[PDB]
Design an enzyme around this catalytic site. Structure first.
Site, PDB file in Angstrom:
ATOM      1  N   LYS A  57       0.965  86.009  75.225  1.00 34.52           N
ATOM      2  CA  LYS A  57      -0.406  86.036  75.719  1.00 34.52           C
ATOM      3  C   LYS A  57      -0.542  86.782  77.047  1.00 34.52           C
ATOM      4  O   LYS A  57      -1.661  87.103  77.467  1.00 34.52           O
ATOM      5  CB  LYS A  57      -0.968  84.606  75.828  1.00 34.52           C
ATOM      6  CG  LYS A  57      -1.121  83.906  74.480  1.00 34.52           C
ATOM      7  CD  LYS A  57      -1.630  82.474  74.651  1.00 34.52           C
ATOM      8  CE  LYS A  57      -1.691  81.635  73.374  1.00 34.52           C
ATOM      9  NZ  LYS A  57      -2.855  81.960  72.501  1.00 34.52           N
TER      10      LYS A  57
ATOM     11  N   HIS B 248      -1.262  81.044  60.128  1.00 29.71           N
ATOM     12  CA  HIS B 248      -1.819  81.267  61.464  1.00 29.71           C
ATOM     13  C   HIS B 248      -0.894  82.010  62.428  1.00 29.71           C
ATOM     14  O   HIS B 248      -1.178  82.041  63.612  1.00 29.71           O
ATOM     15  CB  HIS B 248      -2.198  79.941  62.136  1.00 29.71           C
ATOM     16  CG  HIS B 248      -3.177  79.104  61.379  1.00 29.71           C
ATOM     17  ND1 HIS B 248      -4.503  79.011  61.739  1.00 29.71           N
ATOM     18  CD2 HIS B 248      -3.006  78.267  60.323  1.00 29.71           C
ATOM     19  CE1 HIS B 248      -5.110  78.158  60.926  1.00 29.71           C
ATOM     20  NE2 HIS B 248      -4.229  77.705  60.048  1.00 29.71           N
TER      21      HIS B 248
ATOM     22  N   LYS C 226      -5.868  79.405  78.240  1.00 27.71           N
ATOM     23  CA  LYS C 226      -5.141  79.383  76.963  1.00 27.71           C
ATOM     24  C   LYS C 226      -3.755  78.858  77.296  1.00 27.71           C
ATOM     25  O   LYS C 226      -3.346  78.829  78.460  1.00 27.71           O
ATOM     26  CB  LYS C 226      -5.030  80.762  76.297  1.00 27.71           C
ATOM     27  CG  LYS C 226      -4.517  81.891  77.192  1.00 27.71           C
ATOM     28  CD  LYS C 226      -4.681  83.300  76.580  1.00 27.71           C
ATOM     29  CE  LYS C 226      -6.139  83.760  76.492  1.00 27.71           C
ATOM     30  NZ  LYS C 226      -6.535  84.038  75.110  1.00 27.71           N
ATOM     31  N   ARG C 227      -3.002  78.477  76.273  1.00 27.93           N
ATOM     32  CA  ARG C 227      -1.654  78.009  76.513  1.00 27.93           C
ATOM     33  C   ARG C 227      -0.814  79.122  77.167  1.00 27.93           C
ATOM     34  O   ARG C 227      -1.005  80.327  76.895  1.00 27.93           O
ATOM     35  CB  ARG C 227      -1.007  77.534  75.207  1.00 27.93           C
ATOM     36  CG  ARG C 227      -1.622  76.257  74.654  1.00 27.93           C
ATOM     37  CD  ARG C 227      -1.269  75.027  75.479  1.00 27.93           C
ATOM     38  NE  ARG C 227       0.172  74.785  75.467  1.00 27.93           N
ATOM     39  CZ  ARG C 227       0.799  73.853  74.744  1.00 27.93           C
ATOM     40  NH1 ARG C 227       0.140  73.022  73.931  1.00 27.93           N
ATOM     41  NH2 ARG C 227       2.114  73.735  74.863  1.00 27.93           N
TER      42      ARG C 227
ATOM     43  N   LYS D  96     -15.492  81.939  72.073  1.00 26.64           N
ATOM     44  CA  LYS D  96     -16.213  80.993  72.936  1.00 26.64           C
ATOM     45  C   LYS D  96     -16.796  81.712  74.127  1.00 26.64           C
ATOM     46  O   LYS D  96     -17.925  81.425  74.546  1.00 26.64           O
ATOM     47  CB  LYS D  96     -15.308  79.860  73.416  1.00 26.64           C
ATOM     48  CG  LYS D  96     -14.645  79.037  72.307  1.00 26.64           C
ATOM     49  CD  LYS D  96     -13.565  78.111  72.835  1.00 26.64           C
ATOM     50  CE  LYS D  96     -12.671  77.639  71.707  1.00 26.64           C
ATOM     51  NZ  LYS D  96     -11.568  76.854  72.216  1.00 26.64           N
TER      52      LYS D  96
ATOM     53  N   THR E 236      -9.389  82.147  69.350  1.00 30.08           N
ATOM     54  CA  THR E 236     -10.735  81.554  69.264  1.00 30.08           C
ATOM     55  C   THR E 236     -11.394  81.356  70.626  1.00 30.08           C
ATOM     56  O   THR E 236     -12.629  81.354  70.729  1.00 30.08           O
ATOM     57  CB  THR E 236     -10.702  80.214  68.530  1.00 30.08           C
ATOM     58  OG1 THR E 236      -9.726  79.400  69.161  1.00 30.08           O
ATOM     59  CG2 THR E 236     -10.313  80.420  67.106  1.00 30.08           C
TER      60      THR E 236
END
Ligand SMILES: N[C@@H]1[C@@H](O)[C@H](O)[C@@H](CO)O[C@H]1c1nc(-c2ccc3ccccc3c2)c[nH]1
Ligand SMILES: N[C@@H]1[C@@H](O)[C@H](O)[C@@H](CO)O[C@H]1c1nc(-c2ccc3ccccc3c2)c[nH]1
Ligand SMILES: N[C@@H]1[C@@H](O)[C@H](O)[C@@H](CO)O[C@H]1c1nc(-c2ccc3ccccc3c2)c[nH]1
Ligand SMILES: N[C@@H]1[C@@H](O)[C@H](O)[C@@H](CO)O[C@H]1c1nc(-c2ccc3ccccc3c2)c[nH]1
Ligand SMILES: *Cc1c(COP(=O)(O)O)cnc(C)c1O
Ligand SMILES: *Cc1c(COP(=O)(O)O)cnc(C)c1O
Lengths: 810, 810
Positions: free
Chosen positions: B548, B351, B542-543, B654, B650
């Site tokens: 990111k 992952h 998100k974290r 969503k 993911t």
């Protein structure tokens, strides 16, 4: 099957069967192809528990509406044992459940054996609290038991190589179906911090907080539809506790350790910080709960009219200064008014005179942990001593003796003195013990406030200790005098009219014999040991202690062995001598006593000349569930503490109710048992309290007894020379040294009278008809020793409430 | 009320009402006068849980009888969220429960809000495992999820003064009605010890034992009556553990700490002993359970025909050497046969490619904790490298690169290399990521064994992520194309025939508007914050991570603010910019990013010239239950990681399913989303992977962007000079220093294209009809991103089992 177990109506049985299958499926998520006996036990427990619910809700609603005076019984120990059978007995469901399970192809007695004891006590004190809860519910009192939900109760005892080993009692592993968590009534408890003095009073600040989460257990009364509550607190850390990150979460254990484990010392004080935390935890959470419930009815003048707090020894003594703290610091009452309320609310029961069992906390511990409480204790002390000085002017030594603060290298607080000062009633637990309190250790307090001092002789519940454990005996009694004696035990006096009745004599002896066979089979199955069930069952079960004198019993056993070896072809009444009990893990001499007992067994039980005339068995893991098996099987009850040392005893009473005769000293409640039965129906021996005092004044010299009694000298030479420990000849030298040079309990001084009295027991056992007649006279006069009697006395003479035998509607 | 929520038949509703009242009374021991909303939630949860039981029992019976191949999904994280609503959806009970509670005077939506998230994961990886369980049950696979029952899940985030504070997630405080303890299936797990070599093999001796106690949670499939199991292990000390006495009991915490807390780092490896213990604990207990179940059907040749073990990243990689240990040391298989079985049984999902997220355990830790496993790993390594040498003779550097053992000052085991060697299939989680694995970090392995390498693009369950969280959208879709799309999401393609349908356009926009109003009201109530629900909802949840690029979003927000301040009387499309997510507690830069976001909010939200044209909100405590609220309300989904860094994502999927448009880089699954929808229906910007590589080769110089872009230079000068932190002017200097001198993620390099692309978003938002048409094209093509598709691919291409849509009998 038997009448005292109730009715098994078709409708009832059908409904029990359907609810059992419902719980197996929905609650346990098993089908009958994969279910084990443990699953079947749980399905039955859930089925029976369902019957408690409506009554529990309705009882608590009724107290809210009627608003009676509430009784709060505070204890660090509640030795409950198993719950399933007790619940069935008190709800009259035993025969219905028996039938329902029988029709499902299950043996209910086998399912009952799966349940863990709730072992949240050490022995007598904890078990007394449990009997009391049962009696309070049976007498319709609005009573609450408050304690700590220990994750680990009294350790499980294993014997390895004749030595005690301890294992953790992980009693919650499979779940406890009898408790209901109430996380919504969680309350904060404060520790450490410091005191600030402001314009408007003291403030306790910068404290560490631990949460107290209550778990409630129902306490059903006997067939009256009353269900009271036992509320036990569990410690939880707050969510911001210590809040690198991982370590802070792991360190929550420091807070939660408060409720982790029961201190395993019976009648012995160990002044450790964790124990003090436990004592404050239970008190602080409990008192907030009490005050909350009182406010949901400004005016604390009515507090003592609505609340009684009974202190089970000094272990919850911090309730006194905590109540003062709340009333003065938080509610803003003046000191004098707060003190009046406190004294009228609190009452103290003393359970011991052994000096090593009295709580005396170092000042430095209280200073760090509970700084505000120490200030309040000092103020109580100064005001109390001012009263003493006014009553006894110039008596400076009395001021020193009565102070709550003990001087020394280490200053300590005497918690018993605190409890007397802060309570409207102080009681001992048997007549002789209450007299000793007034003449010796609390003499000064009695002279100042004679009105405070009372006696409340202990008792046992006849539900658990007759109906539950000995249904055969309950039934044969019920056939003659009906069932009312189960909640009015004085009716057993009616049995004196059957002492010459041949059928009754036969039935009493038959029940004992059946109990003995059943116990002998239990021993073979669970422990691979074979005993002669025709022998006299001579039983001493209780915690292992020097003062209880298991060692005196050992000396008698060796005496019998040596007599047999001397004259092997002479007849002797066969005996099975059973001794059982736990030693505190740190109590070296108690552990040595256990080893001696097993070592005697190793010699005696394998000597082919002895045969089955004498067997010595150490009963492993003595606990409430084992008491329920062995006590109905006993012929002879050993109650042989040195006069003046056993405050009451309650095992003694259990044996009397179940058809054993007693060999005992005039100590604790044995005195009152002998008075009720007649001294002619009791095997009394040994020094009385006055004889012990006379020996203490001239000085106890054990060597004198050794020099004068050849049989005693032989035993000591056998112990010393390695006769009972051939591989380690010096193994028992600490025991020999103690007996010869520093025996506080005067074992040798009662030896001769004890052996002679044991010969009278054997003589009576040879005549079974007369043995059984004496038994009937004991059972018949055991009624005074119901805890229903004890509780009615507390209610009327201390709490100011009236008991009631009336039923709530079902 | 709405059709997709099922039928509310009179019989069903009557029975639900009666069972609710039964649980309130018998299970909760409350009456309606004292019950709180939490009591009503529990009564409903128990009522719904009862409907799972028969199906759960019957499903597990069916697997015993049919003996299908079993799939074991091993993960250290399962991010489940709430269970009540999901259970009702999957059993078609939602409308019946709504009606039943309504008739009792209760609002079911309010009761649902009481339930705690089961937060046993960090983010995407844990949530993927949860979606997978749902899909496996829905596809009729005999699948088991195995993990750890952490007492404390992912911390609760509080924001104090704009800074993240962590609080323990005490999710079990009130009980968990969805788990069933199975203490009867408790198993031992071994640690430490040493290895003895005897005549008949190696023996691992002198170990410390910890018990693994399983708790089982049901996993219902969608309307097929299948209920699978998630089995989570909890650590317990044995009863003789450490067995002065009190301390030994308290030290049981050392063993039980294994399952105490979830490590809170997303996509970051911390090599701590406690984490290694967790990994072995789950593996050792799980494998014994697997073998037990296999033996209850000698011949391990059939093992891979009956068992598949899927490794969720390397966290359970010790399954490989543990399986070898059991087969070789305990079952006595020869090495070669054991290895064949192991390889055919195990498969590995990778992952991540971030080097800081790869597990590389120091040899000295394994040597002490798991000495036998280290020996087995060395043997695997030697045999593996022998194969490499034979395939690539003389290529000594390849031997070094491929070794399971990394040389250095500290020798380490590379767990990814172990997983590749010991697995028959290795997959990445989106096409671009699986390609990167073959070209970069696992290139050498791919050259040796090309057949092992696969892709399985991630997905999300449309039960939780459409039907549960967005019933309004589910319903308007169902009105047009029926209900079959809920378990066959490709049917959403049929919606392309409605792209010009005026009624459908209106209904899609209406649902979004309702979701936005509902979320704006949630914000006011729970957080006292007011937002304009006519504004474009621009959402990045998100974290918090450098890769990111929440920082890139921050730069755009400041750009918009500065443009408004420059020309305040010009029209701009109003936005509410919402950013949310947790930072790992030890990740300093992530905590600074959160502080920057709140500091920007403090300026922007209180500038009267801005008005309600721009608002910046930090969404506190982002978790699964908050995702279910915010995602249906979003207009714009921010998916802006540097190309090559987000393995899949993911959250992206969503948002696509729920009617948001996406602004994103060509990274992870964004690539495939754009391909499915058409690039014209996606807001793509920035460097592709190839552009990042080209910049890395010449060297990234952030100063170049600063020198060339005046708007960027202004922002950096504002950050540096204290414009967003007037009391602490240097507060953000670490952020500035990182962006200017050591930015691994090239924030400045994508700034210009990002701002320009955001202007195109605003332009489209001004034309609501065309915005909504583009939305329809996204929803319509989202079908590929169902986890049902993903799982069918795993089943057919890795596990060798056939999915089934057929119903078990009810
Ligand atoms: N679910 C918990 C378990 O976590 C545990 O076995 C125990 C509480 O620690 O009791 C269970 C439980 N017991 C009740 C319950 C219901 C009715 C009762 C009636 C009388 C006495 C206890 C009762 C407990 C509800 N929940
Ligand atoms: N020995 C008496 C018995 O004679 C008596 O029958 C019983 C109930 O009153 O209380 C016992 C008793 N137990 C204690 C006891 C128990 C636990 C303790 C724990 C810490 C410190 C002192 C303790 C004293 C004091 N007294
Ligand atoms: N008593 C325990 C409590 O200790 C606790 O709340 C939890 C287990 O930790 O679940 C409770 C419990 N739950 C069940 C139970 C029964 C049926 C079920 C059906 C589906 C899923 C879970 C179930 C749990 C039995 N006991
Ligand atoms: N970032 C990716 C996402 O891009 C991806 O969508 C998700 C599911 O495949 O897995 C995430 C992921 N999470 C981890 C992760 C999680 C927890 C860890 C704990 C310890 C050490 C490494 C960890 C890596 C690795 N990869
Ligand atoms: C009654 C009882 C005791 C108290 O027995 P004494 O002989 O009074 O010390 C101790 N332990 C258990 C398990 C009991 O049932
Ligand atoms: C889906 C989800 C994630 C993963 O989101 P990404 O944007 O893919 O990182 C993280 N946390 C929660 C609570 C989720 O629901």
């Amino acid at each position: 099957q038997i009448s005292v177990r109730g009715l098994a109506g078709v409708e009832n049985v059908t409904e029990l069967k359907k609810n059992f299958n419902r719980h197996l499926h929905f609650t346990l998520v098993k089908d009958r192809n994969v279910a084990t006996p443990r699953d079947y036990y749980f399905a039955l427990a859930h089925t029976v528990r369902d019957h408690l619910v409506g009554r529990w809700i309705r009882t608590q609603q009724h107290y809210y509406e009627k608003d009676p005076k509430r009784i709060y019984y505070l204890s660090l120990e509640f030795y409950m044992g198993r719950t399933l059978q007790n619940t069935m007995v008190n709800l009259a469901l035993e025969n219905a459940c028996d039938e329902a399970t029988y029709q499902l192809g299950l043996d209910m007695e086998e399912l009952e054996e799966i349940e863990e004891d709730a072992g949240l006590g050490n022995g007598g004190l904890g078990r007394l609290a449990a009997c009391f809860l049962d009696s309070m519910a049976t007498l319709g009192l609005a009573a609450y038991g408050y304690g700590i939900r220990y994750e680990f109760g009294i350790f499980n005892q294993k014997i390895c190589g004749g030595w005690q080993m301890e294992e953790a009692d992980d009693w919650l592993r499979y779940g406890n179906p009898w408790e209901k968590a109430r996380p919504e009534f969680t309350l904060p408890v404060h520790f450490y911090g410091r005191v600030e003095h402001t314009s408007q009073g003291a403030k306790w600040v910068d404290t560490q907080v631990v949460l107290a989460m209550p778990y409630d257990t129902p306490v059903p009364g006997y067939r009256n539809n009353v269900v009271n509550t036992m509320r036990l607190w569990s410690a939880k850390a707050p969510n911001d506790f210590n809040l690198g990150y991982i370590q802070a979460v792991l360190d929550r254990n420091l807070a939660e350790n408060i409720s982790r484990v029961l201190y395993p010392n019976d009648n012995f004080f160990e002044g450790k910080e964790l124990r003090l935390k436990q004592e404050y935890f239970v008190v602080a959470a409990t008192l907030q709960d009490i005050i909350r419930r009182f406010k949901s009815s400004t005016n604390f003048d009515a507090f003592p009219d609505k609340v009684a707090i009974q202190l089970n020894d000094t272990h919850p003594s911090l309730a006194i200064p905590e109540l003062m703290r709340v009333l003065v610091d938080l509610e803003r009452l003046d000191w004098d008014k707060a003190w009046e309320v406190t004294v009228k609310t609190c009452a103290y029961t003393n359970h011991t005179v052994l000096p090593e069992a009295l709580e005396r906390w170092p000042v430095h511990l209280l200073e760090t942990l509970l700084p505000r409480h120490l200030q309040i204790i000092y103020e109580i002390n100064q005001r109390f001593l001012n009263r003493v000085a006014a009553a006894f002017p110039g008596d400076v030594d009395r001021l020193r003796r009565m102070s709550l603060v003990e001087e020394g290298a280490v200053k300590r607080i005497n918690m018993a003195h605190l409890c007397i000062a802060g309570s409207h009633a102080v009681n001992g637990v048997a007549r002789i013990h209450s007299e000793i309190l007034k003449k010796t250790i609390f003499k000064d307090f009695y002279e100042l406030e004679p009105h405070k001092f009372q006696n409340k002789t202990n008792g046992i519940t006849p539900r658990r200790w007759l109906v539950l454990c000995n249904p055969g005996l309950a039934e044969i009694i019920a056939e003659r005098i009906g069932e009312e004696y189960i909640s009015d035990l004085d009716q057993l006096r009616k049995l004196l009219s059957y002492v010459d009745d041949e059928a009754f004599i036969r039935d009493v002896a038959k029940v004992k014999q059946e109990n003995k066979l059943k116990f002998a089979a239990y021993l073979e199955r669970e422990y691979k040991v074979h005993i002669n069930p025709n022998s006299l069952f001579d039983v001493q079960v209780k915690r292992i202690h020097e003062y209880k004198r298991q060692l005196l019993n050992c000396l008698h056993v060796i005496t019998l062995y040596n007599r047999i070896k001397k004259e092997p072809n002479k007849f002797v009444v066969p005996r099975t001598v059973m001794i059982g009990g736990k030693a505190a893990p740190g109590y070296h001499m108690a552990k040595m006593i256990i080893k001696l007992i097993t070592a005697i067994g190793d010699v005696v039980n394998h000597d082919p000349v002895v045969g089955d005339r004498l067997r010595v068995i150490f009963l492993e893991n003595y606990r409430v569930s084992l008491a329920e098996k062995v006590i109905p099987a006993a012929d002879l009850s050993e109650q042989i503490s040195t006069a003046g040392t056993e405050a009451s005893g309650t095992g003694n009473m259990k044996f009397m109710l179940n058809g054993a005769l007693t060999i005992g000293t005039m100590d604790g409640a044995n005195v009152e048992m002998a008075e009720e039965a007649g001294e002619e129906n009791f095997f009394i021996f040994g020094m009385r309290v006055e004889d012990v005092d006379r020996l203490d004044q001239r000085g106890y010299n054990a060597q004198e007894y050794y020099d004068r009694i050849p049989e005693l000298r032989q035993i000591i030479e056998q112990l010393s020379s390695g006769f009972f420990s051939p591989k380690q000849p010096d193994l028992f030298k600490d025991i020999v040294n103690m007996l010869m040079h520093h025996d506080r309990f005067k074992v040798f001084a009662d030896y001769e009278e004890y052996v002679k009295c044991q010969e009278r027991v054997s003589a009576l056992y040879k005549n079974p008809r007369e043995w059984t007649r004496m038994v009937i006279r004991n059972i018949a006069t055991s009624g005074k020793f119901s805890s229903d009697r004890t509780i009615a006395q507390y209610a009327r003479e201390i709490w100011g409430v009236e008991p009631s035998r009336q039923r709530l509607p079902a």
